[PDB]
Design a binder for this molecule. Structure first.
Ligand SMILES: O=C(Nc1cccc(Oc2ccc(Nc3ncnc4ccn(CCOCCO)c34)cc2Cl)c1)NC1CCCCC1
Length: 297
C-alpha cells in the first residue's frame, strides 16, 4: 500500500530569494528562482523558511509535516516541490504568478464576471474536500490563503499542522473552545466566499475583534453582498450555523456552486456581466530563461 511521493532535498544555493512576500505563524515566505545546477532554467518558486524548532521532538515533526505536504496531490491544493534541510528548514513550492485571490479580486472588481466568481467557489471547495478526504484541517482558510495560478485556476495553500488568530474568519466553537474540525473549516469557507462576492471587503469591519463571539452567539452574521441573490447568500449563511454538523459538507458545496455555475446570471447580478503581482514578475526580476515547474517536471 505504498507512498512513492518523491521528496527532493536541495541545497539553498540552487535558489535565489528575490524578496520577502510575507510572514505567518510558522515562518517566512519568499519569492525566488530555482536554478537547478548544470541547467539553463530559472523556475519561479515560493520558499517558506520555517522558524527554528523549539525542541528536538518538534524538529522531528517538521519532517512528519513535510512528509504530509509531499503527498498532497490535487489541482486545487499547493504541492511541495522540495525542501532544504538547513537548521531552519525551507519548503519549496511552485510560484503562483498572479499572487493571492484577495488581491486579485480587489484590483479587478470591475472586470470579474459571475462565471469566474462561482468557479473559484467550486475549486476552493474541491480543494477543501480533498483536504478533508486526507483528514487535514486547514484552520486558516481566508481569501489571502487562496492563490491564483491563472484567472481560471486557483489553489489553496498554507494549510495547518497535520497532527495537532484570524478571529473574523473563525467558527464560533473555534473562538470559544479552540475546536478546529472540517466543519469549522466550512465556516471559514463561507467567510472566504463572502470576501470574493464583495470583491475583497473586510468582514465585520468596524466591529472590534473582541466582540465577534458575542455578535455570533447573538445571531448576527455577515450581510448579503450587493451582487448576491438570496440563493447564494443562503449557502453562506448555512456555513455559519452555530451547530457545526448542520453546516454544508464541502462535497455538497462542490455540487451547489457547480449547479449555480451553469446559469451564473441567475445567481450573481453584476453590471455589464455579459495583476499587481504578475507585473512585478515582469518588472522586479531577471526574466530571461524562466520556465514553469510544469514544463520542467
Ligand atoms: O508550514 C507549514 N505548512 C505549509 C502548507 C502549505 C504551504 C506552506 O508553505 C507556503 C505557504 C504559502 C506560500 N505562499 C505562496 N506560494 C506560492 N505562490 C505564491 C504567491 C504569493 N504567495 C504568498 C501568499 O501566500 C498566501 C499564504 O501566505 C505565494 C508559499 C509556501 Cl512555500 C506551508 N506547516 C508547518 C506546521 C508547523 C511545523 C512546520 C510545518
Amino acid at each position: 500500500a505504498p507512498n512513492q511521493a518523491l521528496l527532493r532535498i536541495l541545497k539553498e544555493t540552487e535558489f535565489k530569494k528575490i524578496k520577502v512576500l510575507g510572514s505567518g505563524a510558522f515562518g517566512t515566505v519568499y519569492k525566488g528562482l530555482w536554478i537547478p545546477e548544470g541547467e539553463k532554467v530559472k523556475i519561479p518558486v515560493a520558499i517558506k523558511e520555517l522558524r527554528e524548532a523549539t525542541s528536538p521532538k518538534a524538529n522531528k515533526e517538521i519532517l512528519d509535516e513535510a512528509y504530509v505536504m509531499a503527498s498532497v496531490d490535487n489541482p486545487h491544493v499547493c504541492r511541495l516541490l522540495g525542501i532544504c534541510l538547513t537548521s531552519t528548514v525551507q519548503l519549496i513550492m511552485q510560484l503562483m504568478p498572479f499572487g493571492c485571490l484577495l488581491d486579485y479580486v480587489r484590483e479587478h472588481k470591475d472586470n470579474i464576471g459571475s462565471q469566474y466568481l462561482l468557479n473559484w467557489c467550486v475549486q476552493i471547495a474541491k480543494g477543501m474536500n480533498y483536504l478533508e478526504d486526507r483528514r487535514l484541517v486547514h484552520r486558516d482558510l481566508a481569501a489571502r490563503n487562496v492563490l491564483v495560478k491563472t484567472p481560471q485556476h486557483v489553489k489553496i495553500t498554507d494549510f495547518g499542522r497535520a497532527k495537532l488568530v484570524p478571529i473574523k474568519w473563525m467558527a464560533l466553537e473555534s473562538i470559544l473552545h479552540r475546536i478546529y474540525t472540517h466543519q469549522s473549516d466550512v465556516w471559514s469557507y463561507g467567510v472566504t466566499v463572502w470576501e470574493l462576492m464583495t470583491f475583497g471587503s473586510k468582514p465585520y469591519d468596524g466591529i472590534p475583534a473582541s466582540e465577534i463571539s458575542s455578535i455570533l452567539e447573538k445571531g448576527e452574521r455577515l450581510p448579503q453582498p450587493p451582487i448576491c441573490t438570496i440563493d447564494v447568500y443562503m449557502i453562506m449563511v448555512k456555513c455559519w450555523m452555530i451547530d457545526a454538523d448542520s453546516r454544508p459538507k464541502f462535497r455538497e458545496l462542490i455540487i451547489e456552486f457547480s449547479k449555480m455555475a451553469r446559469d451564473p446570471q441567475r445567481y450573481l447580478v453584476i453590471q455589464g456581466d455579459e495583476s499587481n503581482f504578475y507585473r512585478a514578475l515582469m518588472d522586479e526580476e531577471d526574466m530571461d530563461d524562466v520556465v514553469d515547474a510544469d514544463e520542467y517536471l
